[PDB]
Amino acid sequence: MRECISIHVGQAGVQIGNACWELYCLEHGIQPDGQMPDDSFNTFFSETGAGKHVPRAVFVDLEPTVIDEVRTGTYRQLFHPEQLITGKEDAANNYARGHYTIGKEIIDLVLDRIRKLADQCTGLQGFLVFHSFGGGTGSGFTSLLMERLSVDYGKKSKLEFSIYPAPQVSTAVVEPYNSILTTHTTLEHSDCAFMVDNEAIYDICRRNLDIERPTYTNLNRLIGQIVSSITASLRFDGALNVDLTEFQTNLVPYPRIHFPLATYAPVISAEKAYHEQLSVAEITNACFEPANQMVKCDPRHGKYMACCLLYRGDVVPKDVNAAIATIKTKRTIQFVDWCPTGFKVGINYQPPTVVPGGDLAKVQRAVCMLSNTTAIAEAWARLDHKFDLMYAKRAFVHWYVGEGMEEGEFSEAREDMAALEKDYEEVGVDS
Amino acid sequence: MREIVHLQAGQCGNQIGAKFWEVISDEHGIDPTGTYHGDSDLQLERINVYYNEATGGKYVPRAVLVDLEPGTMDSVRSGPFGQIFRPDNFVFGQSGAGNNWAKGHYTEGAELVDSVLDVVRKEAESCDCLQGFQLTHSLGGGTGSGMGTLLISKIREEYPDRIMNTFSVVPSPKVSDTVVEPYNATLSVHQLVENTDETYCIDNEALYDICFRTLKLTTPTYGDLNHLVSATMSGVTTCLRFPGQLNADLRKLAVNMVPFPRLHFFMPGFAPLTSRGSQQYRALTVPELTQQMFDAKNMMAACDPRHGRYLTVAAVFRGRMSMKEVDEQMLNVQNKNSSYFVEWIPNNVKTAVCDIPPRGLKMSATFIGNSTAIQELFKRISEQFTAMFRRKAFLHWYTGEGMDEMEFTEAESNMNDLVSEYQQYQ
């Protein structure tokens, strides 16, 4: 009666969806063959008369090298042969190449299967989008997918999970260009958008999980752990359930303010887990701590706007009550004056699961935090500073203007981000 | 309810607390794994004093382990009970002090201490009503005496209205294993007296004589010595963990044993120890425990009570007894040894009786005595200090790291008027 559709775009999308769908299979007991060895799988796994459960997602990327590993690997028989679309040439770190020239050729192939999967489900809440800002495919192709899904389906919700470019390190050179030119599209054709930062997960893995040298394979397990904790209200029973509509109305006050931040706690290894008690006050204090936050911004510098708490496991509502009541006493955490009640909670009975060969410990209770705050504009300002000194010498412009767009798109995208920053600080000013 | 935070610093402190938690675990019935294995139900009542319970029914100790070299925590973790300590209580650096008080206090121990206070604050706040602290260290060098006293000097302003135990290892005339031992001990006891509550002196010379004569052993290794003093270490907090008739905690002791704020040095003792060759010969009865506990050869310090007078004494008894045998016997020994007790205070004895005996014995007694004879250690180390300081020896290793010449004179001056205050009661 309820369903969700996931769209994974780019190399980041297809690689963080592999660990995410791996955890979905283990949570419902789905072996990689595609069958069984409760009707909670119907939101994610369809049905067949032979007993086979197939997923309800699409995998879009212009690089066939990373899509073909799903064909070669263990989950070949489980994933649908046509749900995973293959390109021919990559966008090559270019917004112009992925949007105007190549992206128009494969949009009709993707949208045909989006319509087919949407007609499979009787009741659909919305779409979850996993992509990356700095990729050519994750920015160029997504910028037309969202603007075409918005007119194909009017009031369907659009949740986003974006791999945010990092303040210090990155794997690209023109990432400030690809990040700026996609925020014009995502500001108007999206409902809510969470941000994750790669090197922030690096330091969390180093100083909490005690693993010295992490790899993308365990970063995608942490990101896939967050998405499972978000949607676990839909899948499993609880004391009170929270919908995808519920927190998307509790976290945005304005159409221009739709950028919250994600936080997961506790994050600890198997050896360290059994020595200290993990009470509810233990795990809700780490989410409020700026050290455990996985986006490189300090809420101490910023101001809180709204918060959402997602509890899983052996949790009692009374000790939750004492947790927020203790938090509201602290003056280290600062709230805006126009939102005195900025807390929405959610309770789930099922404790989180663990994967074989994983890094996380078997934990009885966990909490996921989705906090909207003003401190993201600190990260916005340090990115457009890098954009402006790059653009002053007209670097890399001929890669974009020779593929089909004009040069005025750079000016209006910077003008929107200047006005967006003006809107963030005006909201932040109290009366 | 009532909680005791244990601090453990130094090489000798790390070796003395490993056997300390071995004795408690056997007393409370805890396996090396960390699960409760006890025949009775009385051992699980007061377990919150030493243990912090974690999920799965596992009890971990609330003790912190700090040192500058990583060579001793490897031995502790490889020990028989090394797996029960939590791995994040292991706080250590990469460079040792190397037998230098100024290294562990001013240039190297001043960096690690910012993390040590953070760890002990994590456990001092998690309890309900903290009773006090308990530190085990030695004065043999600046690794555990340079920073063990500094930890005392940092916690005192953080928690002023508490009680601090310190089971310090004092130097001895013949087991002097450090040429700069008078330097590192005098500089520590200068900073230790004014900001502590109870201090116990445990030197190796008395433990060697007890193992060779009273216990009749041929090989008194360090495992044997640590078990002797850990019996008294666990024997001082029996009333906190087990029910009895005269319940007396560390503070009810400290009011009686400390008449003046600068008189808080005690003489440890253990009564019922006996060699195997006379175990069947000796009648285990409370006149024999009382007659044995007052002998000078049973004392845990190299001081003779025959050269001093007794200020205040306490005895804590373990096991099902009647109490008037000892009440008659400590009245008896007060009358016959009248010349050895000070006459300006009457009733110098303190009685504590607990209903739970130690493991393997019907009874026990633990002797804690504040006596005037302890100045002989202070006179002996002050004379060694003057000889080494009059020729200005070994001063470049201390003055080269931010220590001035006049700080040693203040250390000597506070030592001399401590024993000048101490002398007037003879």
Binding site: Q277, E282 | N48, E125
Partner: peptide, 29 residues
């Protein structure tokens, strides 16, 4: 490090170990 971030106050213990308000907690049974 990792574990030092999780401070909190109070702790559960178990039913045979008596703590403060162990009387009030046994009484509801």
């Amino acid at each position: 490090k990792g574990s030092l971030t999780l401070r909190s106050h109070h702790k559960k213990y178990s039913k045979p170990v008596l703590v403060y308000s162990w009387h009030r907690d046994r009484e509801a049974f």
